[PDB]
Amino acid sequence: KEYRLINCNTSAITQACPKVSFEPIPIHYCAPAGFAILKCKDKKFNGTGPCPSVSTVQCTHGIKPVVSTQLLLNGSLAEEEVMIRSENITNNAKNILVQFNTPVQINCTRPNIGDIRQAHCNVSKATWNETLGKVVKQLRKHFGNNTIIRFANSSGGDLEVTTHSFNCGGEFFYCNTSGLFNSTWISDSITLPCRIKQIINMWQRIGQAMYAPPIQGVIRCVSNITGLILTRDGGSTSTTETFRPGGGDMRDNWRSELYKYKVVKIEPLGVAPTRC
Amino acid sequence: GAVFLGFLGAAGSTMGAASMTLTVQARNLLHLLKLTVWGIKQLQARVLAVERYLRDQQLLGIWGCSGKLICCTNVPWNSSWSNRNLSEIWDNMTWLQWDKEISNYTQIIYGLLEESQN
Amino acid sequence: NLWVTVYYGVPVWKDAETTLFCASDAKAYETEKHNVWATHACVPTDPNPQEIHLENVTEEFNMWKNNMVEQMHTDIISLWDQSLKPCVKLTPLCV
């Protein structure tokens, strides 16, 4: 009502902005009395299919509410090999979750003119190359003997999905992951230019927010890249494949750590024959 | 009321081994303002577990089997409920297969166990 | 001959899509916003978890159709709406 020019009054709320601290602690999602949480102890588990090594816990492990795009920071690590999970490979629109076995450490630092909208991030080269080598081995195990040409840049669109957006110290860092993904694959350290931006798109809902100007001094963000989020390119008539990073749907962050679990109801009452 | 998990260790094994594990794992498994809120939430967990246990004992109270871990009633099987040699029952099946198999007879058995207290 | 034998403690599951409570052990003396949230909206830990490893069972999990993701998603919506209060919001209505 009524009927195509539905009244979209873009409302606005003004609240106070105290500069807050911010560091996510782990969270254990327990199940109440009468329920139980199953768990897959198979180290090479897809995400679907039968898991034969089911155990039962009351409450989950430590899950950090870490919000980020294109890279899964401070997550958990696969036990044996780099795992690749998707709702539907061949869909070319579903986010390929790539979980690592070793943490690739990243240092996002804002030093102290001092150009408050500027920071940089360092990824240890030749630790990163080994990780992409293992990822391309698993992707060839899915796809065959293709050339991964290339891990491209982000295709564009919104600012928070084009760049490695994350939060650190209450300040929102939008990096530039273009140099970290550029390699074709036939069969020292990297500096990432990472600004600080303050007219943000909310991920909670559809909206925009404005935050306070940045903080006094040195910001340290010692982290672990324990994941990726990739997409693909459909077509065409073999050819080579191109894996642009993506993300933004934050539930893909929570199908990487609530991956092993399932909630069941315990019904303890049964009937049977006798020989009474 | 944390012994609901100890029931589940006998899944996958057959019905006789689970019936032994019943008795075995039953005998073996037995001032700041922001802190009073934790005390109240832990009590709301514990009292809820006690009330769920008492409701589960009251549903065994209708059938004359309250408190008993295993009881043997007086409702004879119409043998159109798993017409099966009971060696194959207690040796070749698990409990999940029973909850699948006699699922269309279970309300009938509950009605008979209620009606055989009168 | 043979007749009904009511048991109790039978290992039988179902599925559920229910309420499911947080969390770990916060500090309850800090001004870190996750610690303030986990104080005012969650319970402490229990130092003795009970991981019962099962016998030869075979469950079929499905990661992409899990009702646990939406629930912690709603909890983190609450965390981020209570911690990082923005200066100006612009959210539409479209009534």
Epitope: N46, T48, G49, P50, N88 | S80, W81, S82, N83, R84, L96, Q97, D99, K100, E101, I102, S103, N104 | W13, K14, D15, T58, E60, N62
Partner: antibody
Framework: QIHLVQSGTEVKKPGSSVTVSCKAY?????????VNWVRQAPGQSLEYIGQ??????????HFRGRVLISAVDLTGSSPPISSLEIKNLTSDDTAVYFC??????????????????????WGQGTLISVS | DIQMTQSPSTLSASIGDTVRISCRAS???????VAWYQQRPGKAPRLLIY???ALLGGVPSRFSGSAAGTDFTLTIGNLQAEDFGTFYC?????????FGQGTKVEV
């Protein structure tokens, strides 16, 4: 929305082998689902052949040693493919073949009883004649 | 296995006629492990009813089923023109499953 598609009509020689494809559009994976191969002689009733439930290939006792049933999951650029190979053909295997898939995700469904299944979704028919 | 016996082997009825088709097992199937299929000619047989009386999702609710241990009764009310095809009853109780014979409903 399973839109299971098979191969086309084929004819072979006796004492030979044959292979029938089964591409499973709209199937998550064969870990969750299960493929039951079944056949039908012309005019007769439907005769079971075999299955690959939980990646365990197994055929019935009439067909042991003669039939191979293989499967490859949804990897990359191709949907999940099941495939039926028959060795040492006789002139009594001229029949319409079917691959079927049913969901084994829910234990309390009723479509399946410990690996013995009702056939909830069907192919379209692969006729093999033997000359 | 456990042989089924479908009855009758051939009938015919008109539009709007309640049709009862029985299927008798050689054993007693306590657990209702009987499916029911409809095959139109030149097509693949779709599933109508599993577990004796559980109705599938994409099926019109005209049908009904019943199970009595050995007798399995399929009942069509308000029969239509689309529902004219060879039926089948399946026992999926014990491995391997085997099917019925075919009740070719005509006019």
């Amino acid at each position: 929305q399973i839109h299971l598609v098979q191969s086309g009509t084929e004819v072979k020689k006796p004492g030979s082998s044959v292979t029938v494809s089964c591409k499973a559009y709209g199937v998550n994976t064969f870990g969750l689902y299960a493929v039951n191969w079944v056949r039908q002689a012309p005019g007769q009733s439907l005769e079971y052949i075999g299955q690959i439930w939980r990646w365990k290939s197994s055929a019935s006792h009439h067909f042991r040693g003669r039939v191979l049933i293989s499967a490859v999951d949804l990897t990359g650029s191709s949907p999940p493919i099941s495939s039926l190979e028959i060795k040492n053909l006789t002139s009594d295997d001229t029949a319409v073949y079917f691959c079927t898939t049913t969901s084994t995700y829910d234990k309390w469904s009723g479509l399946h009883h410990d690996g013995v299944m009702a056939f909830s979704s069907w192919g379209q028919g692969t006729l093999i004649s033997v000359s | 296995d456990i042989q089924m016996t479908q009855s009758p082997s051939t009938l015919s009825a008109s539009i709007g006629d309640t049709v009862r088709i029985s299927c008798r097992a050689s054993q007693s199937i306590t657990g209702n492990w009987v499916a029911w299929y409809q095959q139109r000619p030149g097509k693949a047989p779709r599933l109508l009813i599993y577990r004796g009386a559980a109705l599938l999702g994409g099926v019109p609710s005209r049908f009904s089923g019943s199970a009595a241990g050995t007798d399995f009764t399929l009942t069509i009310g308000n029969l239509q023109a689309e529902d004219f095809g060879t039926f089948y009853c399946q026992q999926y109780d014990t491995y391997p499953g085997t099917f019925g014979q075919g009740t070719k409903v005509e006019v």
